[PDB]
Design a binder for this molecule. Structure first.
Ligand SMILES: Nc1ncnc2c1ncn2[C@@H]1O[C@H](COP(=O)(O)OP(=O)(O)OP(=O)(O)O)[C@@H](O)[C@H]1O
Lengths: 886, 618
């Protein structure tokens, strides 16, 4: 009989885990009799019932969630304490954490809609009021008393939990409840409430770090909340966080090692210093490149505190770089840039410097020194058979056309500096050659020769930060290849190969010209994203994960991208699929869509340039755009992706598996790029793994919403859902698998909204170069928002980007976020009203227009967000390079 | 396997009725009951019963595709285009079937079948399909499109052939052991040596040797690398050697990369590789000179890496044999191996343009005191074998005397007590324990006991083999710390200090006790070397070595050696303990310590003890 009882209890646990509550309720209903025969069986029964009722009260709304959980308090402050809840400490821990979650569920049911308390039943409403202990209120203290009951039971659970895998969960549930209680008061203006929540941050920080010491992923993804909570509660939690980090093992911060070395200047860099100095001790190859990028902006703010931080940064610099081999590698990668691009960036940044009054020579010397160290003085730190050919034909046009730097150029002359700079640039774009082998490109990497004595360089991108690193297995640089191909792409990066010590080729992409920290923070957000999906059950069933690569920013204007192997771009997959007549009639036909779009733009505008767009926005109605987009889109061949997947798969089983994996991965990256709004999603920014079929998204240059702010033509679609995707799913449509994967992913993201918007603190703490440049190009014009947001408050621009991201992940119309971005960036354009009247819909022919501005639901959001992305009115007016017909 | 009732003497008897002759036949055939072995059908039933009795959660590990990348990496074709078209000759039609679609089923059916008729049929079909693949590759129009590039099919077919050629079945081994060798003979021809397919075959062999399951597969791909070398330095022209991606320089480079790998199977694979190619290495002279020093330092460092592994993998047993082969190579060509050419510089050396046998003898002498055991013994043995064949052919007694005088006495003590050359570690900096900078973890204690063993083995070998007299090194003229280390160990570690008195798991107690008992035995051998080798200088070993602590340890390992921590499960150490105890007690007879030994044995071995043992019932 005891065996039959235990087997039925395990079946009930499995039925609860598989969301079979209607079966588990019957199987547990017929064990209520036998459970009373013993005390063990009664405790295990009521814990099974209470846990089943907690899992049951998620789909039910308020006034049906509180009913389902209210029957489980009526039998838990009852008996079984008689010699059994005193003998078993684990049953006491489970008992307390179950009753704490019970009171938490009631208090959170009575808080979003606190007009439901007497809207259930009077006996049960009096049961609520007598459970809290506070009396004779309507809604003012019953919720606070239930909160105090939940906190009391969870604290008893932690005290009974300290005597892993069993204590981690009580730790995390208490810290999660207390962090939610700390987050609930950010939008209420009260000091009584702050005075009763002030005991919480210590019991957040200490318990979360004591969970992280027991090898927990769920505490490791909640570390930017710890680094954020000191900015809000510094005097009760900074020394506690300082002493509680020090027992945590050495390696659980290597993923967060770009938050730490950028927080290493602020007035909270005392709780981070032991971990930074010991990572510098143990693994002086993880922290080096973030230190070299972070050390260019620190601004130590002379006080009695800041000298310690100056000396700490100096000692970290002394502990790293140990022979200059990393700095030599950086300076040897800086040689394989086209100098014409560096000249272009120098001229643009000088023009941005001179376009502001009261322009001084206090900060023009700092720009002339680097361009003279790079594109001036020939006796350099190092160069090769390309830079000397550059310099001995163009440096003599610098010492007379400007002359000496800070003694002749310092006139204002923005009309005349632009004259001479253009007059040199028009000859500088007519002598550049694609540089050949590495014997002419950088004569350090060619004869690298590892054996100096012992200066070992790892290949960057490693140290994922999810376990003990074991740095012996990491492949180290033992040579370079003698091939570099330069890809044109309007900006020219270089594909090199780092020959490892295991006699293998490791291709990397070296791009110079732009700051690359934004790619790195986007990939860090993707790593947080597919750690969020891995703990959500509906996404861990389908195994939804985002394919991330490693981006290593070394300095500004220098970074390394990992080059993934045996992938092709999406446009190459779609052009190799076509036959000889299809490719010919697509690249060369007056009636092909690449030419017909330009002809139709000229027939709707009269102009040939980028102005043809802004004259066809206001100039064209819906129908002339929609029917011409359909007539354009009916010209390309229909089933290209189906043809590629039939050509690459063995059988019908393999074709269904490859098509489901392609559609599932692309539907995951659509919602993932929309959450942190990425643009420039043309077909050369998607890569497909040719061995697995999955899609990889690259190039996060327009990372937060900026393709619809800082562009001469705005991008109004949230992601890429053109015709060649939705004809892969035929005979069915996009409303099946792609929609359902998007619902599950967006629901997991909106389950815990805190993690993604707490990871983004690095965007406002250490802002990149392109975000300060976008801040100055946004502060130039000024529009409606200037009388609404404070410009003298903070850096304020990544705070606004986090406000948009948090706002759309709180439930928001994607039509609203897009027109808000057009309002924020495209004021005083002639066609701004048409921009909003396109990006908002048409009220009878769309679903994104007859929806509320916010408060939106889970399925409704993606239902009005797929409407925007495949809309012929929007897709008929998009940049020609995007190719919205494909 | 339907075996019904045939025409037996039971059926023809039972066809006429049910009578006593059928009873006689049943008591014969039914009651044979001698024995019968287990068949394949009973095994298949037991495998289903095993999979049912593991459960349901353990159960679905037979379908080990639970990672999503190994899910989706099994749905793509082996090559995108269909190669191996076959026009089936009927009389009038010749339709085309593509044999690419049969390859993944036939390969797994030839590897894992359990049915010998299915397995033999699959092996024959795979053989003829590989022949079809080699024929269809060399077709008549052009190498680009008139010859299909079937690199993608070769890349997945070659490991199957490598496993089939070491298969335990007799027929498939007779079938695929010649096919692999014929295939290496063809792919190391002049016609297809710069190809990408011979790179695929070489990569398949070098991924065969590192395989962490099948030892037979590693043993066979060693012969495959040997055949690759033997037919790649013969069929081709000698100047086209050093222009191929698969030449012997790049092969040896990839061998060294395998040899210094942290994973034990890759080092074991590189060791097997040299153990199979040492003949064709030693019989080529413009290759052996530049590479023998580099290869010896690589394999010595691989053996030093093989110290911290698990002692059923046998990386030590292969790596020492590889080192012995390089040794004997150096022996046969030593008359030219002590010129001063510019060889390929071994890693870790300071840079030079001359490479002789002399600085290699200096290197081995520098690494005599390293902590890692078998590398230390091999370094010492190689030094003692490389001295007499040099300029002048001096003994080590002369050579080390000269090097000792022209560099100082404490140079030798720094090589011995200073543990290894790439660190300033050793028992110079830690004579006692008393400090290790931490909470006294167990990997630190083994490191110190192992450093004590290193310095002890160095001193014992150099004093016992008459190269250096004991009086000049153990006297105080350069301030060694060995006798202080020995004194500390016998004082407070040797007797009882298992995990209890070394902090001032039960499974970690044995890994301690092995390293403690080996240094007890090595202390005793060092003492006997002192008392037999220097019958003038026993005065130095008075305050530390030969005292009541050594005699208490000696009478304890004499009478009850389990109490010190020796395990009786070993038999070599327990058979060796008689010899070291008798040699120490025999060397303690021609010494003034004879009396203290006799009073230590007189306390523990008496006549009253023998009367007390036998007064009990036995
Ligand atoms: N992570 C990567 N893995 C493999 N290939 C890449 C990767 N990133 C870029 N590439 C290759 O490099 C080329 C350009 O890359 P990318 O788009 O990132 O730089 P870019 O073109 O300067 O940026 P943008 O697309 O904004 O112009 C592409 O054609 C692509 O094939």
């Amino acid at each position: 009989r005891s065996c039959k009882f235990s087997m039925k209890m395990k079946m009930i646990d499995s039925a609860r885990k598989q969301n079979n509550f209607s079966l588990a309720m019957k199987l547990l209903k017929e064990l209520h009799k036998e459970s009373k025969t013993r005390d063990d069986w009664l405790v295990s029964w009521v814990q099974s019932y209470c846990r089943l009722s907690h899992c049951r009260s998620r789909s039910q709304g308020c006034s049906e969630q509180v009913l389902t959980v209210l029957k489980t308090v009526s039998l838990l402050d009852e008996n079984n304490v008689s010699s059994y809840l005193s003998k078993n400490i684990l049953a006491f821990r489970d008992q307390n954490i179950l009753l704490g979650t019970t009171y938490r569920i009631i208090a959170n049911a009575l808080s979003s809609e606190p007009a439901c308390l007497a809207e259930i039943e009077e006996d049960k409403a009096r049961r609520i009021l007598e459970l809290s202990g506070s009396s004779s209120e309507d809604s003012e203290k019953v919720i606070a008393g239930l909160y105090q009951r939940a906190f009391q039971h969870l604290s008893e659970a932690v005290q009974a939990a300290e005597e892993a895998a069993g204590v981690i969960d009580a730790y995390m549930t208490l810290a999660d409840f207390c962090d939610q209680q700390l987050r609930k008061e950010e939008e209420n203006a009260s000091v009584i409430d702050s005075a009763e929540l002030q005991a919480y941050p210590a019991l957040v920080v200490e318990k979360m770090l004591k969970a992280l010491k027991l090898n927990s992923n769920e505490a490791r993804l909640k570390f930017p909340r710890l680094l954020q909570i000191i900015e809000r509660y510094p005097e009760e939690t900074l020394s506690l966080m300082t002493k509680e980090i020090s027992s945590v093992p050495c390696w659980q911060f290597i993923s967060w090692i770009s938050h730490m070395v950028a927080l290493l200047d602020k007035d909270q860099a005392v709780a981070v210093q032991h971990s930074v100095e010991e990572i510098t001790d143990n693994y002086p190859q993880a922290i080096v490149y973030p230190f070299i990028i972070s050390s260019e902006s620190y601004s130590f703010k002379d006080t009695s505190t800041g000298h310690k931080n100056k000396e700490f940064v100096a000692r970290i610099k002394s502990k790293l770089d140990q022979g200059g081999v990393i700095q030599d590698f950086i300076n040897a990668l800086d040689q394989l840039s086209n100098p014409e691009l560096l000249f272009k960036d120098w001229s643009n940044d000088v023009r941005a410097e001179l376009a502001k009054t009261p322009v001084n020579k206090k900060n023009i010397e700092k720009m002339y020194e680097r361009m003279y160290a790079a594109l001036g003085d020939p006796k350099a730190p190092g160069l090769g058979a390309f830079r000397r050919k550059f310099i001995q034909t163009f440096g003599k046009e610098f010492d007379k056309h400007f002359g000496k730097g800070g003694s002749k150029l310092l006139r204002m002359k923005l009309s005349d500096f632009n004259d001479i700079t253009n007059m040199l640039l028009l000859k500088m774009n007519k002598d550049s050659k694609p540089p050949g082998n590495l014997k002419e490109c950088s004569p350090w990497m060619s004869d690298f020769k590892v054996e100096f004595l012992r200066n070992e360089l790892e290949i960057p991108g490693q140290y994922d930060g999810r376990g003990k690193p074991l740095p012996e297995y990491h492949v180290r640089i033992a040579g370079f290849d003698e091939r570099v191909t330069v890809m044109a792409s309007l900006r020219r990066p270089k594909r090199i190969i780092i020959r490892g010590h295991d006699e293998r080729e490791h291709p990397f992409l070296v791009k110079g010209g732009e700051d690359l920290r934004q790619d790195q923070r986007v990939e860090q957000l993707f790593q947080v994203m597919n750690g969020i999906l891995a703990q959500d059950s509906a996404c861990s069933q389908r195994a939804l994960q985002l394919r991330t690569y490693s981006v290593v920013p070394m300095t500004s204007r220098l970074g390394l991208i990992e080059w993934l192997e045996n992938t092709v771009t999406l446009k190459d997959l779609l052009l190799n699929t076509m036959s000889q007549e299809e490719k010919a009639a697509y690249l060369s036909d007056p009636r092909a869509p690449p030419c017909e779009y330009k002809d139709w733009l000229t027939k709707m505008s009269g102009k040939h340039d980028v102005g043809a767009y802004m004259l066809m926005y206001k100039g064209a109605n819906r129908t002339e755009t929609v029917t011409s987009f359909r007539k354009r889109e009916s010209k390309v061949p229909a089933d290209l992706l189906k043809r590629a997947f039939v050509r690459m798969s063995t059988s019908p089983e393999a074709f269904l598996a490859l098509r489901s994996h392609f559609a599932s991965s692309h539907a995951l990256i659509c919602i993932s790029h929309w959450i942190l709004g990425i643009g420039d999603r043309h077909l050369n920014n998607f890569m497909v793994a040719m061995e697995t079929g999955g899609v990889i998204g690259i190039d996060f240059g327009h990372a937060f919403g900026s393709a619809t702010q800082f562009l001469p033509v705005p991008e109004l679609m949230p992601f890429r859902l053109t015709r060649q995707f939705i004809n892969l799913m035929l005979p069915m449509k996009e409303t099946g698998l792609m929609y359902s994967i998007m619902v599950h992913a967006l629901r997991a993201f909106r389950s815990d909204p805190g993690l993604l918007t707490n990871t983004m603190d690095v965007f406002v703490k250490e802002p990149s170069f392109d975000w300060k440049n976008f801040e100055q190009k946004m502060l130039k014009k000024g529009g409606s928002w200037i009388q609404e947001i404070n410009v003298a408050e903070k850096n304020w621009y990544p705070r606004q980007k986090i406000c948009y991201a948090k706002r759309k992940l709180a439930g928001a119309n994607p039509a609203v976020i897009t027109c808000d971005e057009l309002l924020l960036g495209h004021e005083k354009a002639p066609a701004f009203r048409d921009y909003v009247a396109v990006a908002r819909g048409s009220k009878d022919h769309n679903i994104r227009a007859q929806e509320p501005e916010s408060g939106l639901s889970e399925e409704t959001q993606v239902k009005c967000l797929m409407d925007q992305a495949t809309d012929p009115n929007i897709l008929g007016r998009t940049w020609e390079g995007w190719e919205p017909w494909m | 396997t339907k075996n019904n009732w045939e025409v037996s003497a039971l059926s023809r008897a039972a066809q006429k009725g049910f009578n006593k002759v059928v009873l006689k036949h049943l008591k014969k055939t039914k009651n044979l009951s001698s024995n019968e072995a287990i068949s394949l059908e009973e095994i298949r039933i037991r495998v289903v019963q095993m999979l049912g009795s593991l459960g349901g959660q353990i159960n679905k590990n037979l379908l080990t595709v639970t990672s999503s990348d190994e899910m989706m990496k099994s749905y793509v074709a082996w090559d995108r285009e269909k190669r191996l078209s076959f026009a089936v000759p009927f009389r009038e039609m010749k339709p085309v079937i593509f044999l690419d679609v049969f390859l993944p089923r036939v390969t797994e059916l030839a590897l894992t079948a359990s049915d010998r008729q299915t397995k033999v049929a699959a092996c024959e079909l795979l053989h003829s399909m590989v022949m079809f693949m080699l024929g269809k590759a060399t077709q008549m129009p052009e190498g680009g499109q008139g010859a299909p590039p079937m690199y993608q099919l070769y890349k997945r077919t070659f490991p199957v052939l490598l496993r089939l050629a070491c298969d335990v079945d007799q027929v498939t081994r007779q079938l695929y052991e010649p096919l692999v060798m014929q295939l290496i003979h063809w792919f190391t021809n002049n016609k297809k040596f710069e190809s990408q397919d011979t790179v695929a075959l070489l990569e398949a062999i070098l991924d065969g040797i590192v395989d962490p399951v099948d030892s037979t597969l590693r043993d066979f791909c060693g012969r495959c690398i040997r055949e690759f070398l033997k037919w790649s330095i013969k069929q081709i022209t000698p100047q086209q050697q050093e222009k191929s991606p698969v030449n012997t320089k790049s092969l040896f480079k990839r061998l060294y990369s395998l040899a210094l790998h942290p994973n034990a199977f890759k080092r074991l694979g590189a060791s097997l590789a040299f153990n199979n190619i040492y003949r064709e290495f030693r019989e080529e002279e413009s290759l052996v000179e530049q590479f023998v020093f580099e290869a010896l330092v690589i394999y010595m460092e691989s053996l030093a890496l093989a110290h911290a592994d698990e002692k059923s993998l046998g990386t030590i047993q292969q790596c020492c044999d590889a080192i012995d082969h390089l040794c004997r190579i150096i022996e046969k060509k030593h008359v030219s191996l002590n010129k001063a050419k510019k060889r390929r510089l071994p890693r870790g050396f300071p840079p030079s343009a001359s490479l002789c046998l002399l600085d290699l003898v200096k290197w081995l002498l520098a690494h005599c005191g390293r902590p890692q055991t078998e590398c230390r013994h091999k370094s010492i043995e190689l030094f003692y074998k490389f001295v007499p064949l040099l300029p002048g052919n001096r003994s080590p007694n002369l050579w080390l005397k000269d090097v000792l005088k022209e560099e100082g006495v404490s140079f030798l003590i720094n090589t011995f007590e200073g543990g290894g050359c790439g660190q300033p570690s050793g028992i110079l900096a830690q004579p006692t324990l008393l400090y290790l900078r931490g909470p006294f973890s167990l990997q630190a204690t083994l490191c110190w006991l192992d450093l004590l063993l290193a310095a002890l083995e160095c001193y014992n070998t150099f004093i016992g083999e008459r190269t250096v007299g004991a009086l000049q090194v153990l006297g105080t003229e350069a301030q060694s710390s060995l006798l202080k280390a020995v004194a500390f160990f016998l004082e407070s570690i040797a007797m009882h200090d298992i995990i209890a008195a070394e902090k001032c798991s039960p499974q970690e107690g044995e890994r301690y006790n092995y390293s403690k008992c080996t240094v007890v035995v090595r202390i005793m051998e060092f003492t006997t070397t002192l008392l037999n080798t220097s019958p003038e200088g026993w005065k130095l070993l008075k305050k530390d070595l030969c005292n009541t602590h050594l005699m208490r340890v000696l009478v304890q390992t004499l009478c009850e050696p389990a109490s010190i921590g020796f395990n009786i499960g070993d038999v070599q150490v327990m058979a060796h303990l008689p010899d070291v105890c008798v040699n120490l007690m025999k060397a303690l007879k021609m010494s003034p310590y004879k009396d203290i030994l006799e009073t230590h044995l007189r306390e523990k071995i008496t006549a009253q003890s023998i009367e007390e043992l036998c007064a009990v019932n036995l």
